């Protein structure tokens, strides 16, 4: 964000497209008011249609965009918008992208999970530490998300404090290092995770076992998990819950009727 004469000149970073999250289209535009709202309803020939009151700021030769200060319009009314090759779009107010000073950088934290968008753990917490060690203080957030910090140039380290351990498992390193500098001024660090899914497994013997029988499960490897006899249906042993595919062994530290019920989606 710089000025020439009376400037107001926003030049977006280069969108390094080449891909499926590569950017095909970008626009700067401001949202004019009319009748009180930032949209209007035009009665077309076929029926009714609705649209934001966009007015586009042309891309100058210089690569920049000229934010002429004008009217009753403000920097919280200007938007920079991007559409990637798969057709997701993202917008931001030019005020929020301007809120990061020129001497500062942006780091962004997130979970890489192999599932779609809405079936994702959206909640977790982290801690950011110095070149020396101390936690980061006076947190400045970026574009209205709590996982994008604005920090001065330097070397830093971030730690995954907490997340939903009853919903997923950490698959990558818990403390990752990142460095913000004048050219590398936007880093994204992610913690890859794998989704956890659970089953209710139950071994239902046809006849009562002899007292103190030990009923157990044999995992993928030679591991064994102990099952506890239910208090309400004494024939029904299958107690435990962890999920993945098993076979049943009864020690005394001989039927079957084995049932696992896919149970999940909290």
């Amino acid at each position: 964000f710089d000025t020439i004469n009376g400037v107001d000149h926003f030049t977006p970073d280069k969108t390094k497209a080449l891909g499926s999250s590569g950017i095909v289209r970008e626009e700067v535009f401001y949202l004019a008011k009319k009748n009180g709202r930032k949209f209007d309803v035009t009665e077309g020939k076929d029926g009714i249609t609705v649209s934001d009151n966009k007015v586009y700021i042309p891309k100058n030769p210089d690569g920049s965009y000229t934010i002429s200060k004008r009217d009753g319009v403000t920097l919280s009314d200007y938007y920079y918008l991007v559409e990637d090759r798969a057709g997701n779009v993202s917008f931001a107010t030019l005020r929020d992208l301007k809120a990061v000073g020129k001497d500062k950088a942006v780091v962004n934290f997130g979970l890489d999970l192999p599932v779609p968008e809405d079936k994702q753990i959206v909640n977790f917490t982290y801690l950011v530490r110095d070149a020396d060690g101390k936690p980061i203080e006076n947190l400045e957030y970026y574009n209205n998300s709590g996982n994008s910090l604005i920090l001065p140039y330097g070397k830093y380290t971030v730690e995954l404090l907490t997340y939903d351990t009853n919903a997923a498992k950490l698959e990558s390193d818990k403390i990752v290092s990142f460095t913000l500098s004048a050219d590398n001024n936007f880093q994204q660090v992610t913690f890859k995770m794998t989704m956890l899914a659970t089953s209710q497994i139950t071994a239902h013997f046809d006849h009562l076992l002899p007292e103190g029988s030990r009923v157990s499960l044999k995992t993928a490897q030679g591991q064994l998990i102990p099952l506890e006899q239910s208090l309400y249906v004494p024939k029904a042993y299958g107690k435990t819950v962890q999920e993945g595919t098993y076979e049943v062994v009864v020690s005394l530290p001989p039927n079957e009727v084995h049932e696992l019920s896919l149970r999940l989606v909290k």
Partner: protein
């Protein structure tokens, strides 16, 4: 030369019997895991550090190096370790005061407050949840492990989830607790403060008896799950009226008053005034009024001081009716005498606290969590005096556990670490005093009070404790059938054998007959005399309890058609002296099939077709309104109007499938010419009634819910 000791709880829980034997927590350690302390308070002190477990900051540093713990620090001889586990930039000071407060100075009331274990040292882990509870689980586990490592003797855990299961909790937490047990560490946890299914609406209906809500992890086998009784005494700012200093049935004219949501609150120690207008409407007033007219909480014209409509209820209800512009109120025996003396007289509100007898004294706390585990086990384990109910009972049992663990370490020196913590729990439960509900004059259900109110003396004096088949201070039978039998085992820890006579009191739930709802009071069906057994010194003996409940199956099944609880206590006394060696063990079973109770509430359509109604369903508007926002089991679909002069661009949102908008604009469950509603959908794409999805009122925890469609021929 020291001020006297406040014994409001000590006299009831019988701590003196433990102190007078040498058990004050010397060289023991309680780890409070909670939201915040102040290690500098007048009460964070110990007498004689030479006997403490941790004798110096250097000792503490040593342990931290040994255990591999590079954070937190020793603070004083009392708080020997403290740390923040939520480190990224008081409530639990009371709990610490209660376990281990040892003050030389006196408090506001003139007396000095001593915790249960005044000579214990303390460790403080700041841990709590912020957005999605369960994310905090990892910090809690780090806390438990550090308490264990740096050498705690008891852990007071502040953590709850509502309707916990005993055998099927959260794997890493339950395991870290198991390691804590294997290190000899009692783990004490509040039961919870949600009380029963539907506590914010009405009492549970008699067809739905799985109403328990005890919370995880107190529902684990290992932790001690503490329910809460209301203290007999309160310490708070009273309100005086001097023309009444003579009528002692009114604490000598000092009232307990309350308020709700802070309208324009009090202006202390100034002889204000008011007279009595009990005609609630338009009297010649010159501005105390009886809220006898239960109409609406609207305070009077300018000067309030309302009083109770129900003689002796002494609820002093929160929410001031029976915005601002005055102040709150609400007591009664002071009202119907304050209204004497000519019509009116002068009062003032005190600025220094006083002791005064409690209005809810000796009654189970309304919010203390109740009922079984989600998967059928008997919790909570025990009661102590205490939305911060159970949370203030919990440290009482943590301190008691310190004292009893001391007893065990002296008189059973070779009892192994892997087996002491359970003995501490079992002695506490077996020696508790069974409560009686002073209102209904009948025994409180073990689903509410556990093995009874704490009794520290009994636990460190009798050598007895009691046990069931599963080797635990209480008995979870399971399904019951017309004939209940179980085997009780008594253990003796003294070196002189004792002889005990034992009977069996049997209880079920009391049910309100005109409303078809439990009353959350118990009903004593019968006491079954059971004989006599002699417990060998340093041994055990087993007797069998057998009961025939056949006589009751008609009436109980009729008032509770899906099964009822049969529960109660096996009570042992000394054979020659009725008051020695009082021990007992609670049991509960279910006459029916608990594991099969209905999971979802009946469908709203079926219910309407029997003239019945749901448990949360508002019968508000027109006849057979089922507004999608109400609470019912039914199907929901999405509607959109057919517009003849435009393309529609707007859906109408969800509505109850089977209901249709009427003249006034309300969705009514319309009936076809045969009399019935009609569930039907049209997947044409028009986005009008194109799908059907399930909406439930769930009576029980569930899993594996899914929807399927079959042909009706099938």
């Amino acid at each position: 030369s020291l001020p006297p000791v406040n014994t409001d709880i000590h006299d009831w829980v019988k701590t003196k019997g433990a102190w007078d034997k040498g058990y004050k927590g010397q060289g023991k350690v309680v780890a409070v895991i909670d939201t915040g302390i102040d290690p500098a308070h007048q009460s964070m002190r110990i007498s004689d550090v030479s006997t403490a477990k941790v004798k110096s900051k250097e000792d503490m540093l040593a342990r931290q190096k040994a255990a591999g713990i590079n954070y937190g620090s020793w603070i004083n001889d009392k708080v020997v370790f403290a740390h923040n586990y939520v480190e990224n930039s008081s409530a639990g000071m009371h709990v610490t005061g209660i376990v281990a407060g040892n003050s030389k100075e006196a408090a506001a009331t003139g007396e000095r407050f001593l915790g249960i274990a005044p000579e214990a040292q303390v460790m403080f882990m700041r841990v709590f949840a912020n957005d999605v509870m369960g994310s905090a689980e990892s910090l809690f586990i780090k806390a438990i492990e550090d308490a264990v490592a740096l050498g705690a003797d008891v852990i007071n855990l502040s953590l709850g989830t509502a309707n916990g299961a005993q055998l099927s909790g959260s794997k890493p937490l339950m395991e870290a607790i198991e390691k804590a047990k294997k290190a000899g560490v009692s783990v004490v946890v509040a039961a919870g403060n949600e009380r029963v299914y539907g506590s914010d609406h009405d009492d549970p209906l008699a067809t739905n008896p799985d109403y328990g809500l005890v919370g995880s992890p107190s529902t684990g086998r290992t932790p001690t799950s503490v329910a809460a009784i209301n203290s007999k005494w309160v310490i708070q700012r009273l309100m005086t009226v001097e023309e009444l200093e003579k009528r002692a049935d009114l604490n000598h004219g000092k009232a307990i008053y309350s308020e709700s949501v802070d309208f324009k609150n009090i202006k202390d120690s100034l002889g204000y005034d008011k007279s009595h207008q009990f005609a609630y409407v338009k009297e010649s007033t010159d501005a105390q009024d009886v809220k006898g007219k239960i109409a609406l909480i609207e305070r009077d014209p300018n000067k309030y001081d309302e009083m109770i409509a129900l003689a002796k209820k002494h609820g002093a209800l929160g929410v001031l009716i029976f915005i601002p512009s005055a102040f709150i109120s609400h007591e009664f025996g002071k009202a119907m005498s304050q209204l004497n003396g000519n019509g009116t007289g002068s009062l003032e509100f005190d600025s220094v606290v006083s002791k005064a007898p409690s209005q809810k004294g000796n009654e189970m706390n309304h919010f203390s969590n109740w009922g079984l585990t989600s998967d059928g086990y008997l919790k909570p384990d025990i009661t102590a005096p205490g939305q911060t109910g159970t949370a203030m009972a919990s440290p009482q049992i943590a301190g008691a556990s310190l004292l009893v663990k001391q007893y065990l370490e002296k008189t059973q020196p070779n009892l192994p670490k892997e087996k002491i913590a359970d003995i501490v729990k079992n002695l506490l439960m077996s020696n508790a005093q069974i409560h009686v509900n002073p209102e209904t004059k009948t025994t409180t259900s073990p689903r509410q009070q556990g093995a009874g109110l704490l009794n520290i003396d009994g636990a460190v004096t009798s050598g007895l404790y009691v046990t069931g088949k599963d080797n635990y201070g209480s008995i979870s039978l399971g399904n019951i059938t017309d004939t209940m039998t179980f085997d009780v085992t008594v253990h003796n820890l003294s070196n002189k054998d004792k002889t005990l006579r034992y009977d069996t009191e049997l209880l079920t739930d009391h049910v309100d007959p005109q409303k078809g709802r439990f009353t959350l009071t118990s009903r004593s069906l019968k006491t079954y005399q059971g004989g006599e057994v002699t417990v060998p010194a340093n041994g055990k003996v087993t007797v069998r309890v057998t009961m025939d409940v056949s006589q009751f199956t008609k009436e109980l099944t009729k008032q509770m058609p899906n099964g009822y609880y049969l529960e109660g206590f096996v009570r042992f006394r000394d054979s020659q002296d009725d008051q020695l060696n009082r021990v007992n063990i609670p049991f509960v079973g279910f006459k029916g099939q608990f594991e099969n109770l209905a999971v979802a509430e009946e469908s709203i359509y079926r219910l309407k077709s029997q003239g019945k109604t749901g448990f949360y369903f508002d019968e508000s508007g027109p006849k057979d309104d089922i507004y999608v926002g109400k609470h019912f089991t039914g199907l929901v679909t999405l509607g959109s109007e057919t517009n003849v002069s435009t393309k529609t661009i707007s859906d109408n949102g969800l509505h109850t499938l089977g209901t249709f908008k009427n003249a006034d604009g309300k969705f009514i469950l319309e009936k076809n010419a045969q009399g019935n509603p009609v569930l039907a959908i049209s997947p044409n794409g028009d986005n009008n009634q194109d799908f059907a999805a399930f909406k439930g009122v769930f009576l029980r925890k569930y899993q594996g819910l899914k929807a399927s469609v079959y042909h009706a021929s099938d």
